Each structure stands twice: as structure tokens, then as C-alpha cells.
Task: structure prediction
Amino acid sequence: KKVIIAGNGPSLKEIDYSRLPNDFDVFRCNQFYFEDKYYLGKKCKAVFYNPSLFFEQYYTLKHLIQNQEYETELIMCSNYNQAHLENENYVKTFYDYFPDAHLGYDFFKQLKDFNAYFKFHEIYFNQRITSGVYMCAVAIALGYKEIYLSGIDFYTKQKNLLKLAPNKNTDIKALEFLEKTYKIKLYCLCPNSLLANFIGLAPNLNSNFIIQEKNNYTKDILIPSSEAYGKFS
Amino acid sequence: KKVIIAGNGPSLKEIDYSRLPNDFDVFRCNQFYFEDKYYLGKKCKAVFYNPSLFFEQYYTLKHLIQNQEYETELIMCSNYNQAHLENENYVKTFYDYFPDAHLGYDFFKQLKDFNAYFKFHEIYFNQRITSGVYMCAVAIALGYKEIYLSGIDFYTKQKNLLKLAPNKNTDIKALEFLEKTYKIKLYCLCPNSLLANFIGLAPNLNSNFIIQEKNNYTKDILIPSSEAYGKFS
Amino acid sequence: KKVIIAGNGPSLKEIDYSRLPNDFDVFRCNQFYFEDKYYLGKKCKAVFYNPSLFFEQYYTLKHLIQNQEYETELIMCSNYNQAHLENENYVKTFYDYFPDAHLGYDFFKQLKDFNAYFKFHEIYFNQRITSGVYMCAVAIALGYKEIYLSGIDFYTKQKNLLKLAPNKNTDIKALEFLEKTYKIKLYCLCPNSLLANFIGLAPNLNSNFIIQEKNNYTKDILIPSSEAYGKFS
Amino acid sequence: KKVIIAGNGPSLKEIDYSRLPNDFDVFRCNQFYFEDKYYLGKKCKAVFYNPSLFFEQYYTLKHLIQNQEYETELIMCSNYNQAHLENENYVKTFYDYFPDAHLGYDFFKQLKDFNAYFKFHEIYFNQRITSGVYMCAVAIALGYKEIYLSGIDFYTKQKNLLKLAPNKNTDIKALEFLEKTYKIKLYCLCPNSLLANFIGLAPNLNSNFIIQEKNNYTKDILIPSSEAYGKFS
Ligand SMILES: CC(=O)N[C@@H]1[C@@H](O)[C@@H](F)[C@@](OP(=O)(O)OC[C@H]2O[C@@H](n3ccc(N)nc3=O)[C@H](O)[C@@H]2O)(C(=O)O)O[C@H]1[C@H](O)[C@H](O)CO
Ligand SMILES: CC(=O)N[C@@H]1[C@@H](O)[C@@H](F)[C@@](OP(=O)(O)OC[C@H]2O[C@@H](n3ccc(N)nc3=O)[C@H](O)[C@@H]2O)(C(=O)O)O[C@H]1[C@H](O)[C@H](O)CO
Ligand SMILES: CC(=O)N[C@@H]1[C@@H](O)[C@@H](F)[C@@](OP(=O)(O)OC[C@H]2O[C@@H](n3ccc(N)nc3=O)[C@H](O)[C@@H]2O)(C(=O)O)O[C@H]1[C@H](O)[C@H](O)CO
Ligand SMILES: CC(=O)N[C@@H]1[C@@H](O)[C@@H](F)[C@@](OP(=O)(O)OC[C@H]2O[C@@H](n3ccc(N)nc3=O)[C@H](O)[C@@H]2O)(C(=O)O)O[C@H]1[C@H](O)[C@H](O)CO
Result:
């Protein structure tokens, strides 16, 4: 099938929906549930979370799912099997703590050339990709052929999130490598994004999509009990 | 086949045997051999022991077997692959210390949805299931379709046991999840149990069963030599 | 095929060779090369060494092989996968230090019932079997059906050996368990041994065997250089 | 196919190219890119690097590849799975740091007899082989039948290299073992080498080969940033 992969850059709001493929799977990441409307609908094929907040994102997702704000078929931890990037003890026992989730690296490492590319530039040059690229890589490994990009921009101030994380060339070069090496097609869904300097626009299909508005929704990350943190540590 | 799973609640004594399936396998747990009579016969399909007393239960079982008080085809350690719940070094080398036994988690983890369910509520909410649920989960993973419950109540003071261990909604919710998710049937064999507020009675078959009385039997856990403990540590 | 398994008890010298099967494989152990004559010939199917002297026995064997005193097809380390019995780091990397050798436990653990039997009595009762039983167990796992025993007695004072190691019911019970459980046949080749109180004599076949005498032979264990010991530590 | 394996001894310059097989794969090692001319062409089937400089050779190779000085299909780390010879933590996570490279030991250990041979003499006698032998062993494991040797001599002073590494019978005996045991053929391409006392000359085929000269080339090992070293440590 087709996949729309979203970062959560301002252009997430600036999709041209006449270009929306209309049968598609959706990939979301990180604080996607901060969106003020369902810019891509409620149903995700995969959501992707950074290893350093995976424990709190998983807890929050289960609340979104049960509160019926979103559904997802897959839950990914966006890992790389590198000690300087993530806690290895957590990776080793992951499937036992989170039996319905997946380490993204099980799919990422299937792209041997891109994994080699990524590693070489990160270890030796400190060049890092964003979730939106990691997601294209996992999407390619999953067998997707047409990938439609949105919310990727170059380049939220919620209380809980601020308390846990008090915090382009690389991306475009990576995305080009992927496209060139694996022979899939990349499209750009956001004409007013800088991504559109670099990526061929999704074609107009005069498609429609209803953007449902969100009211009384979850717009910050949840924080587990101390006793939960004690178990996980 | 059919399985009767027993906890050792007071209702173990209060089975309505007219409802007993009459070809069945039996699952027992923990201090089941404290029973003052053979309420389910001598022959077990599986006995299940908590990891923290597994070393002393295994020793005791071998004595029951050789003293011909009980037989069992399988011996399970009821583990979960969680550091805060059990000693991981012991899990890793288990099959070498106990080559005729099984880690229950090899079967429990086959129920991906229930394992996810269990983990999420235990890690984040401190909700724990009892052996009787763990046993239904292992029974489902083993391919059983009709499961008859007894000795589960909501919710023994022997010397050796006291020296080693100086010591419902969750259960009913778990059992419902299992039944709903795996499409097996749960029956209740003890009409006078609270379990019967929640679980459909096993149907009357006017079956008979002989309850053999126990005399001069093993009714406390055995304690290994110090030298045995030294090896195991 | 048939196997003769030898301990190195006095009865090794007291074989009745009229009873020798005449097509057979030979299992030897430990300081077998101390024999003053080739009581079973030069050609071994397997030699078995205790883990605690495996490094010095392997070194010595390679010298026997190259000095053409003995040949062997297999080299076994007689291990059990138990921390209190052997060094586990050495077991883990064994095949990399000794790529032409085998951990005996890879075959021993194939006899699930005997492994369970062994473990239970050793861990809990401190009952240990001798190499001659370990060898029957490995021989059974290897597919042998007729096993002829010698040099097992119930129940050498060389310089190097003394410097490295300054040092029955269980056996007979184990051997009986093996015979009963795996349905192989045990024979006794040494009529004047106590083993013959317990084991059915190999039948007379009026077979002949030449006992070659040994002259100028290796009759103590060799000791590796310090630098070798430094690597191995 | 045929393989030319090169060490980088003086005889690398002294190939008799009339004897060059003319369809062949090339194996290079270590500081091969110091060559002042393309004595074997630019295209390598495999390059092999010692584990202790693998991090800096890999970085340097990627620069050679991108600077179009050389191409290679395979990148090998010449390891042995021995703690005293290499860092084991690095071996364990190798494929994640270097996803397009290979541990040479995955192929070397396929030659069970040679691996046994190597280990026995190194651990116990401190006899070590050179890269050129390690390379023949990997070449045999890879399915090569005819192996043409060069740059092996019995038995560079660049700044970066000097800063990282401030630094025959065994070889000939090993090469003979390989030839004898695996039934491949060894040839010698350098008539004026001592190797030719021991190895049958590649036959004259009056073949031609163009030796391209090298100008403005990479002739020392590159040194990664500190921050790269920090990640890798
Ligand atoms: C603090 C920190 O370092 N934050 C990083 C950020 O540099 C980047 F690594 C990324 O960005 P993330 O927030 O998930 O948002 C996902 C995508 O949304 C787009 N976007 C978002 C906001 C904005 N103002 N301009 C944009 O363009 C980006 O193009 C990106 O690819 C990522 O993983 O790619 O993740 C965050 C956090 O580590 C993460 O949110 C923790 O849950
Ligand atoms: C001290 C402590 O925490 N004990 C726990 C208890 O909270 C519970 F985890 C359980 O209960 P366990 O004793 O095996 O008994 C098995 C079953 O028998 C029923 N029953 C028993 C006695 C009673 N008076 N009312 C009852 O209802 C329960 O419904 C339960 O499912 C269990 O694993 O499910 O195990 C025991 C011990 O850890 C175990 O005995 C050590 O060998
Ligand atoms: C010091 C110490 O504890 N020694 C043990 C011993 O208790 C026993 F574990 C055994 O005996 P081992 O010497 O190999 O000899 C092998 C067989 O030869 C027989 N025999 C030998 C001499 C004798 N005088 N009477 C006999 O009966 C035994 O019946 C035994 O099965 C064994 O592994 O079975 O191994 C030795 C050493 O650990 C080993 O030699 C180190 O290389
Ligand atoms: C300092 C130190 O110990 N150096 C060793 C050396 O003893 C030997 F282990 C070897 O030799 P290496 O340099 O790669 O060169 C590869 C081959 O080139 C030949 N040759 C080279 C120069 C010369 N003057 N006479 C020669 O004969 C040898 O026959 C050898 O097989 C090896 O791995 O076989 O590797 C080097 C370094 O560890 C390596 O360069 C680090 O990258």
C-alpha cells in the first residue's frame, strides 16, 4: 500500500488534501497527539517514539487508545543498537516490558546500505537523522513503494513534556539515498514546505478528506507513578 | 482436551462433582499438596510454582512423586521475564538446574495480547494476577478450549512454609480478557464460590468422582540442606 | 556400533578378551595414557576430560597424537552447565579456544530424564557420578545400543598430575537408570571386578586381541608454559 | 573464481604479470593503499584490517571509496574470538557499528581443522600467522580453489600510522596445512620472493596488465575526531 509519513512541523497543518492518495496507511511520531485537529485521521498504521521517552509515550498511547483518541496497529521504538544513543539493557529486555511493541531497529537494520550510511555519518561526523527519515527507512523495510511526506520542515511547550525533556542537509541527503538505493517513490504533500524545494509533489487527484476537530483531547505526555519508574529502572 | 485449573481457596473442597467433565487434565499450584483429600485426584497434568520458592517446591515435588502422593506430567515455574518480579540469572540457567521443568513464560508469552495486558497493568498500575489466572493463560497457550475453574475465591500455617515465606477485580478482568480474546470457554465448578457471580457454571452431567482421603501425607514444604542452598546461590 | 567404555580402575588390566565384541569404538578418560600397555588399542572413538584439567589434557593429547601414541576421533570436555561444578566463562567461549573439541554437555543434555536425575541428586544430595557413567550417558546420546564396561571398580602418582590436582551406589544406580530408561544393553568385560556383582557379563565369543606393550611413553600430564596459562586465564 | 591475495611486502612491486591469471578477484590488507601504483588495480574483492586499527581503517576506506581511489566488495575485520587477541565487546556489537563489514572469523571458523591448528599453536606456543595466511583461510572458506600469492616476504613510516601503532616457518607451515587439508592450489606470483623457495610458481600465460601510477593519493591512515573516538569507546 501507500503510506503518509508525518513529522509534526508546521506543514502538518498545510497539507493539500486534493493530493491525498485516498487509500493509505499513516505513520506518526513523538508528540503527534498534540495536533489540534485530526490532520491525518485517528487511525495510524504505526506510531514511532524515541527511546529516551519510550516508557512515558507508551503509557500515554495506551491512554489515547483507551480514551479512543487514536488507534494504531504498530508501536515502534526508534532505536539504533548503539550504546551512545540508547540504553542497551532496555533494548535487550524490550519485548518483555512491551510485548505489543517493536524495536524499530529490527526493520531499520534490514536496509543494510542505509544502516551503513547512517552509522558512518553519525559515529564519525555526528550527523543525525530526524524521526521522519527513520520512519521512511522503516516504511521501505516494511515493503512500501510510495511514500508521501508531510510535517517535515527544517526546522508544543507543554508542562509534562518540558519536565521530561527540558529541550536538514542530513535529512534531504538521507531521503535521496533511500529513494535512489531502494527504488521507491517519495512525494511531497505540503506545497508550502521547504521540503517541496527538494521533493516531487504528490499529484493532484482532487481528493477530499474530512479534518475532524479535536476537543478536550490529550495534549501533553502523561507521567507514570514513581513506583512505575522504580520498576522500570 | 478439557482442563480443571485449581487454586487452593476454600472452594476447592466445595466442588459440585456432578458437573465434573469426566475426561480432563488437572493444573495445580503452590501448596496444593496441603489438601486433606484428593479433591481432584493424584494425577496432575501440570503443577505451577512461584519463582521465589521454586527451589524448595521442586525438591518437595520430587519427594511427593517418589512417595507416590502425586504424579505430574509437567512442572512449571510461573515467571514473567521482569527483573522486579524474579531473579533473572535463575531464569537464564533454569533448564540446566531443572531439566525436566518448564519456565511458564515460554507458554505465557505466546499470548501476545494478554502478556501486553498483564505487563501494562503491573508495571504502571501495580496490578498483579494470581496463579489461577497465570494457569488459564498457560492452559490457553497449550491449546485447551474448555477450562473449568475451582479453588479461586477472593480471597495453611505450616512451619517450613512460614519459615520461607513469612507472609479480584484484576483477576476477573483478566479472565474475561482471556475468554473474550482467545475464544475459549470458562466454566465454574464451585457454585458456592464468589467466582460464580462472574463465571458460567459447568453444566450438570450427573458425573461421579471418588474423593480419596489422605492419611500420613506431606502437608508442609520441605527444606533443602544448606549445602544444597549454597550450590543454588 | 558397539562401544567399550573404560575407566582406568585396576580391572582395565583384567579384561577377559575372549568376550571382546571385535568390532567396537573405544571411549577413554582422564589419565588413560598412563596405561602401561594398549589394553584397548591406540585408536579411541572419544577421550573425555574433566573441565578443571581440560587445558592441560588438551595440550597433552595433542602431544600424544603427534607422538603417535594414540588417535582419537572426538575430544570431550565432561561438563554439566552448573556454576558450582565448572567455570562458565570457559564453557561459553569453549569452541573458540578448542575448535576441534566438544562440550560433553551438548550430548549429555539430550538425555533429559538422566540429566534431571543427575541434577536433582547432585544439587540436593551431593551425589556425583564418575566419568565412566558420564561416558555411558554421552554414548547413549550418540546412538550406541550395546555398551561394554571396563576399568570401573569402586574405587598414578605422577609429578605433573600431583602438581595440578593435589588429590558406587550412585554409579550403579545411575547405570541402571540409563539401562532401564533408554533401553540399551550394558555388558561387563571384567569378570573379577565388583562391577560384575551388578552387570551382565559380556558373552564369550572366543575372540582374540593383541595387547601391544608400551615403551618410552607419555605417563604424566604435560604442563603448558606460563604464557599459555596467561592467555587462557 | 581465482583470487590474488596480497600482503604488502616488497615483492608486491615484483610481480611477474605474464603469470597473472587475467580473470581474478583481489584481496588486500592493512596499509595496502600506501602502494605508489595500482600493482593489482583499484578494484578489490575484499580488504582485511586488524581489529586494533579497524575503527581508523574503516574511516580511511570510506574516504578511499568516496575519493575513488579504490573499490571493494567486502570489508573484513581479521578477528579470532580470543580475549587476549581482540576486544570482545567490540566483536559482539560489530555488525551494528559497521553494518556493511564482516568479522573475518565468521569465515575463518568454517575451516575447523585450520582454526584448531591456529588456536593450538597460538595459545600454547605463541605462534601467530600474518594477514596473508588469514586471507588464504578466509579465501578457502569462501569457496576459492586457486589462490595466487604476492607481497608475502619474510619479512611505510607515515605520521598518522606511527601515532596509532608506534611499531615465516609459522606462515609456510600454515599455508602448507591449508593446501594439504582443503585441496586447493597455491601459486606464487613473485619469482624473486623467498615465498618462491616454498610455493609453485603461477604458470606463464604471457598475460598483460596495465600498472596505473598513483598521483596525489592517500598514503597515510586517517584519524577520526575525538568525538568519534568518544562514541566508539
Ligand atoms: C529537543 C529535541 O532535540 N527534540 C527532537 C528533534 O530535534 C527531532 F530529533 C525530533 O522531532 P519531533 O519532535 O519528533 O517532530 C517530528 C518531525 O516534526 C518536524 N517539526 C516539528 C516541530 C517544528 N517546530 N518543526 C519541524 O520541522 C520535524 O521536521 C521532525 O522530523 C525527531 O525525532 O525527529 O524529535 C525531537 C524530540 O526528541 C522528540 O519530540 C521527543 O519525543
Ligand atoms: C503470601 C502471598 O502473597 N501469597 C500468594 C498469594 O497472594 C497469591 F499470589 C497466590 O495464592 P496461592 O497461595 O497459590 O493459592 C492459589 C489460589 O488459591 C486461592 N486461595 C487460597 C487460599 C485462600 N485462603 N483463599 C483463596 O482464594 C486463590 O484464589 C489463588 O488463586 C498465587 O500465586 O495465586 O500465591 C501465594 C504464595 O505466593 C504462594 O502460595 C507461594 O507458594
Ligand atoms: C582426585 C579425584 O577426585 N579424582 C577423580 C575421581 O574421584 C573420579 F571422579 C574420576 O576418576 P578417573 O581418575 O577419571 O578414573 C576413571 C575411572 O577409572 C576408575 N578407577 C581408577 C583408579 C582406581 N584406583 N580405581 C578405579 O575404580 C574409576 O572407577 C573411574 O570411573 C572420574 O572422573 O570418574 O576422576 C578423577 C580425577 O578428577 C581425574 O582423574 C582428573 O583427570
Ligand atoms: C607492527 C606490527 O606488528 N605490524 C604487523 C605485522 O607484523 C603483521 F602481522 C602484518 O603485516 P602487514 O603490515 O599487514 O603487511 C601485510 C603483508 O605484507 C608483507 N610485508 C610487508 C612489509 C614488509 N617490509 N615485509 C613484508 O613481508 C608481510 O609478508 C605481510 O603478510 C599482518 O597483519 O600480516 O600486520 C602488521 C600491522 O599489525 C598492520 O599493518 C596494522 O595495520
Remarks:
- The longest strand of chain C covers residues 43-49.
- Chain C touches chain D through 15 residues (CB under 8 Å).
- Chain C has ten helices and seven strands.
